[PDB]
Design a protein around this ligand. Structure first.
Ligand SMILES: [Mg+2]
Ligand SMILES: [Zn+2]
Lengths: 168, 225, 346, 104, 49, 49, 96, 48
DNA sequence: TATAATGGGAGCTGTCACGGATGCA
DNA sequence: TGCATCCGTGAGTAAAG
């Protein structure tokens, strides 16, 4: 077929995982002695592909008769090495993180969607103020807690863990 | 600021539990809860103390923001903003137009707003950020590898601090550092100080820098070569 | 704005302990660990699962996740089940539950109270390849280990025992993360011993040492070649985006040619080689050409044994070897006559 | 004495010039009002009246009691293209831009 | 003919250059006064006039 | 100026080693790491504008 | 650079020059067969040494690099046809 | 010289700090075998 | 694995003009 | 409804380096 259009759109975590051939779990590049890629690191042939055409990492499969075969000893597909330019990997985050393009490109798309000013989105995103998702009937300073309210750390602790003090 | 409730028999709630008015504290249900708060079982004093506090859900960071963005019903907001577009004040009409533009972009495109928050971070193919032996046996490498390494170290330490039940100050620090790691990977220099390699003032070259500028991908290798 | 200023503020929130509060918290921690041991004795459950449940309830439902060592996935359902099996204990048994809960709360407050010591230690490890914040977090990991291993019966203040594990964690992280090409901890130690040794030799010699002088100062088992190999293995990579020239114009990587992908001359020479080989194989009969293509790997990529080609054509291995030999002989004759394949031998 | 490449750029970007001339939002007739300390110019339609207050030393391209088109220059200087667009329409702005660029 | 273990990586004259050799310097590892950077066995310099 | 910067880094290292270490046996040779000064000068002379 | 046996830079403005002439094919050569269409450059060299006309080019590799560097920024970039159905410029080599 | 304030102990030594490039007779330098020149810089003089 | 140790340093500066978002009165 | 004020962004080509 002939290319006629080029679309660009946001990618879902499921889409990003669909691209990925493996999760990069170790911050390691190559071995200081073998000068071969480390397992589950940024250059792993198990994830991104063979370094030599139609040859797995250990050496059990080394010709084109095996094509698409995944070696059982080392786990590297036998294809062309060109694929190390194309196969994405991914990192699974413990906490979600905001894509800075949609935060710092004013007017912020996130902060516009949620009616959150640049200062408020900054304070929540870089852990300077809490934001309420459910007040569970909380009351602060004589007014009840409305959703999407910006509580400082002192206020959040006074609400969530109560007031107290110690005197010497 | 707490509420005392002595007890004489087997107590039914342990330390740390969240209590609401009308909850059974001890003695098979005889002594119960008055105020909202948190349970401090004092066995020395034989009293079940309750310090007044609500069970309020208040988060920080992209987890909170992602929740809120998931919670957006787009058509409802479009309706509210259309109603706002009939307002006399020109500023309110302007703001509702600027918001409704984003809303309708997401609606007509089919993109979920929450997708502006990353759970899985993609990793570029290794040949596009090579680790090559230069003539003579030494190694040259792209900056993206050090940015990804920062990211993966901080993410792994976060997973371990979670699995090991760390306090809140520490998890908060780790999460802040993780957001900034991602930010440096994607648009280093944009927010805050730019990440540099040790012993050099040079900013590392992130993905945005690869795309744009005089030396960016478009002008340097796509519109001319 | 500045993340270290923010963390220093959050650290300045929790007040510093008095000797009494320190001893009290440490004591509660020890007694809570003992109580979890006793609860494992009674319930016959796993001590780690019990600790995870007590921790889950003390921290709240805000944090609940699957622990790697646990055999069961830690979700609020199973923690409610285990908390109910715990709450259904006799008074003198259920007492240990409150003990463990208070111990966990003391653990949290002890860590938070001593978070400043980590900063005051880590500030002296800057410039070794790790960000200040990275050092602070690794030191906090050391502080958690110290809390879990402290013994208040020894009457030592907590700072003393904590400083050991804090330094340990900082140095382990510097040794495990600083290099883009990761080097084992023992090899990093040997490299730094070599560095310090050569620096002493230069400080006494008035010049940089040779490999041999460093081998002398390193002791036995060390010769000049080993010093050289160690220095070679310790070399760190350089940035592909290193500036060349004084403008913002060129990168160092722009001058590095790609050796991997074949050049157009290479691809063309391979193509002409394959076509000339087919030209020379068409001067054989179909069988001798097929035997050569099977025995050399031009058909399916691999070389077959004489027994396989003989079983495929239905002849003896001696006969298949003989027709391979006569095919090679005809090819040698044709090549001597036409010389159409010589130039490809380089 | 010209403005050169900066003038060309000021035109192609449709920037409101620094030394901007004032133009009439409507048609009408001119009535000058000049105190020894302040100066203003009034454009008066058959039922309307606009007031253009301007600093003392501004050069006028208009004689008192004249009939000026909507968007016609009163002060000397470079016309704001967006003001011209609102007052007189697209063809006027196209003429103005083409001619002003060609002058350089 | 067996494929030799090694390959030709010699330093040739680049396109559009040349002249008369006037100096050669050779430094080898294991020679007096000489120590190269880690890894290199020998360094050769040719001066062409 | 570049010398002054190298000296400042050397002094930072000096105080670093002064705080810790067996304070009975601390010579000048045990406190001075000359490397930051060397690096500052080498930088000035090799890669300054 | 001469020292690297390098090629001349045919930059943005040289591209404009070729565009203003309407030399679509000369320009497409510069953008594919002579720079970074790998298959294209190989096939062109082979056709010339054989005496054939040069083949029609294909995708320049740096555009594939652009697609992958956008994917690295969580942006899905999709070459479509007129039926809005995706086209794979990676020839399957990166789709599981 | 090192001095412990309380102990009064005073240990003295001449330590080696590396090398400083020397300028040749004609005002140039020799860095890694190649002659180099440090160019004077003009700037705004300090003051009020 | 055990004296006690409990909040950081570096800024670094002769444009410039525009455009667009925020901030006040 | 209008202004000052701040932040982000861009500022020529090829060559050698
Ligand atoms: Mg020896
Ligand atoms: Zn294998």
């Amino acid at each position: 077929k002939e290319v006629r259009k080029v679309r660009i759109a946001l990618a879902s975590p499921e889409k990003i995982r669909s691209w990925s051939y493996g999760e990069v779990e170790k911050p390691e590049t190559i071995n200081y002695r073998t000068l071969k890629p480390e397992r589950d690191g940024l250059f792993d042939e198990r994830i991104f592909g063979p370094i030599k055409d139609y040859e797995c990492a250990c050496g059990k499969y080394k010709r084109q008769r095996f094509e698409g075969k995944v070696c059982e000893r080392c786990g590297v597909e036998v294809t062309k090495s060109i694929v190390r330019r194309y196969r994405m990997g991914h990192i699974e985050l413990a906490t979600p993180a905001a894509h800075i393009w949609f935060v710092k490109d004013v007017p912020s798309k996130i902060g516009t969607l949620l009616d959150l000013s640049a200062t408020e989105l900054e304070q929540v995103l870089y852990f300077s103020k809490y934001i309420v998702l459910d007040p569970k009937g909380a009351i602060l300073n004589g007014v009840p807690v409305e959703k999407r309210q910006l509580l400082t750390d002192e206020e959040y602790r006074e609400l969530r863990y109560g007031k107290q003090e110690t005197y010497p | 600021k707490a509420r005392v409730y002595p007890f004489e028999d087997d107590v039914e709630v342990s330390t740390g539990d969240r209590v609401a008015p009308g909850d059974v504290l001890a003695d098979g249900g005889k002594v119960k809860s008055d105020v909202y708060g948190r349970v401090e079982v004092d066995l020395v004093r034989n009293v079940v103390r309750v310090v007044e506090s609500y069970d309020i859900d208040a988060r920080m960071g992209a987890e909170a923001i992602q929740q809120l963005l998931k919670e957006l019903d787009l058509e409802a907001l479009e309706k509210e903003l259309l109603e706002e577009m009939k307002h006399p004040s020109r500023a309110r009409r302007a703001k509702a137009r600027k918001r409704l533009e984003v809303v309708r972009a997401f609606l007509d495109s089919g993109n979920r707003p929450e997708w502006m928050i990353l759970e899985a971070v993609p990793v570029l193919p290794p040949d596009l950020r090579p680790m090559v032996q230069v003539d003579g046996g030494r190694f040259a490498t792209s900056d993206l590898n050090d940015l990804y390494r920062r990211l993966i170290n901080r993410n792994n330490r976060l997973k371990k601090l979670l699995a090991q039940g760390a306090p809140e100050i520490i998890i908060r620090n780790e999460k802040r550092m993780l957001q900034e790691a991602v930010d440096a990977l994607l648009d280093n220099g944009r927010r805050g100080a730019p990440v540099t390699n040790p012993g050099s003032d040079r900013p590392l070259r992130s993905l945005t820098d690869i795309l744009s500028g005089k030396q960016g991908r478009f002008r340097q290798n796509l519109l001319g070569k | 704005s500045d993340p270290v200023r923010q963390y220093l503020h959050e650290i300045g929130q929790v007040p510093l302990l008095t000797l009494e509060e320190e001893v009290e918290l440490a004591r509660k921690v020890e007694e809570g660990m003992e109580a979890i041991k006793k609860l494992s004795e009674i319930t016959g459950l796993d001590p780690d699962l019990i600790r995870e449940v007590v921790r889950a309830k003390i921290l709240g439902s805000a944090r609940v996740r699957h622990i790697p060592g646990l055999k069961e996935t830690l979700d609020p359902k199973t923690v409610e089940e285990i908390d109910q099996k715990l709450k259904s204990l006799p008074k003198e048994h259920k007492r240990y539950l409150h003990i463990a809960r208070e111990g966990e709360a003391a653990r949290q407050h002890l860590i938070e109270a001593n978070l400043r010591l980590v900063v005051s230690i880590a500030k002296k490890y800057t410039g070794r390849g790790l960000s200040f914040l990275d050092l602070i977090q690794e030191g906090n990991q050391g502080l958690i280990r110290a809390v879990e291993k402290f013994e208040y019966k020894r009457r030592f203040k907590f700072s003393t025992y904590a400083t050991w594990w804090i330094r340990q964690a900082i140095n382990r992280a510097i040794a495990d993360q600083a290099r883009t090409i990761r080097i084992p901890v023992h090899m990093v130690e040997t490299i730094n011993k070599l560095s310090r040794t050569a620096r002493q030799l230069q400080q006494e010699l008035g010049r940089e040492p040779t490999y041999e002088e460093i081998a002398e100062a390193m002791g036995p088992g060390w010769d000049a070649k080993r010093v050289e190999e160690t220095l070679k293995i310790a070399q760190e990579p350089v940035s592909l985006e290193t500036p060349i020239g004084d403008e913002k114009d060129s990168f160092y990587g722009d001058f590095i040619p790609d050796e991997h992908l074949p050049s157009p001359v290479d691809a063309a020479t391979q193509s002409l080689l394959s076509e000339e080989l087919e030209k020379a194989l068409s001067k054989l009969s179909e069988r001798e050409a097929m035997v050569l293509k099977l025995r050399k790997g031009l058909i399916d990529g691999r070389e077959h044994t004489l027994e396989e080609v003989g079983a495929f054509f239905g002849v003896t291995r001696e006969r298949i070897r003989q027709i391979e030999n006569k095919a090679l002989r005809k090819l040698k004759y044709h090549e001597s006559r036409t010389r159409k394949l010589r130039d490809f031998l380089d | 004495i010209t403005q050169g490449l900066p003038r060309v750029i000021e035109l192609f970007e449709a920037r409101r010039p620094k030394a901007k001339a004032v133009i009439s939002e409507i048609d009408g007739v001119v009535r000058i009002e000049e105190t020894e300390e302040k100066l203003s110019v009034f454009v008066e339609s058959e039922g309307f009246s606009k007031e253009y207050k301007l600093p003392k030393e501004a050069r006028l391209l208009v004689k008192d009691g004249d009939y000026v088109e909507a968007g016609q220059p009163l002060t000397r200087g470079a016309i704001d293209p967006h003001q011209l667009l609102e007052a007189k329409g697209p063809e006027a702005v196209e003429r103005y831009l083409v001619e002003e660029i060609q002058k350089v | 003919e067996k494929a030799r273990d090694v390959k030709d990586t010699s330093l040739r004259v680049p396109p559009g250059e040349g002249g008369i050799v006037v100096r050669t310097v050779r430094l080898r590892r294991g020679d007096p006064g000489v120590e190269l950077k880690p890894g290199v066995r020998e360094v050769v310099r040719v001066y062409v006039a | 100026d570049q010398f002054r910067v190298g000296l400042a880094r050397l002094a930072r290292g000096v105080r670093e080693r002064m705080l810790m270490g067996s304070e009975d046996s601390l010579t000048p040779a045990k406190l001075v790491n000359s490397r930051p000064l060397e690096a500052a000068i080498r930088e000035f002379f090799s890669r300054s504008q | 650079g001469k020292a690297q046996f390098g090629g001349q830079r045919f930059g943005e403005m040289e591209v404009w020059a070729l565009e203003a002439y309407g030399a679509a094919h000369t320009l497409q050569e510069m953008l594919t067969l002579k720079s970074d269409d790998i298959e294209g450059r190989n096939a062109a060299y082979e056709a010339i040494i054989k005496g054939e006309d040069v083949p029609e080019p294909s995708v320049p590799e740096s555009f594939r690099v652009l697609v992958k560097e956008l994917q690295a920024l969580a942006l899905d970039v999709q070459t479509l046809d007129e039926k809005d159905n995706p086209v794979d410029i990676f020839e399957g080599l990166a789709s599981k | 010289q090192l001095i412990h304030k309380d102990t009064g102990l005073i240990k003295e030594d001449e330590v080696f700090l590396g090398h400083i490039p020397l300028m040749t007779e004609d005002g140039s330098f020799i860095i890694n075998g190649a002659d180099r020149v440090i160019v004077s810089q003009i700037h705004r003089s300090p003051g009020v």
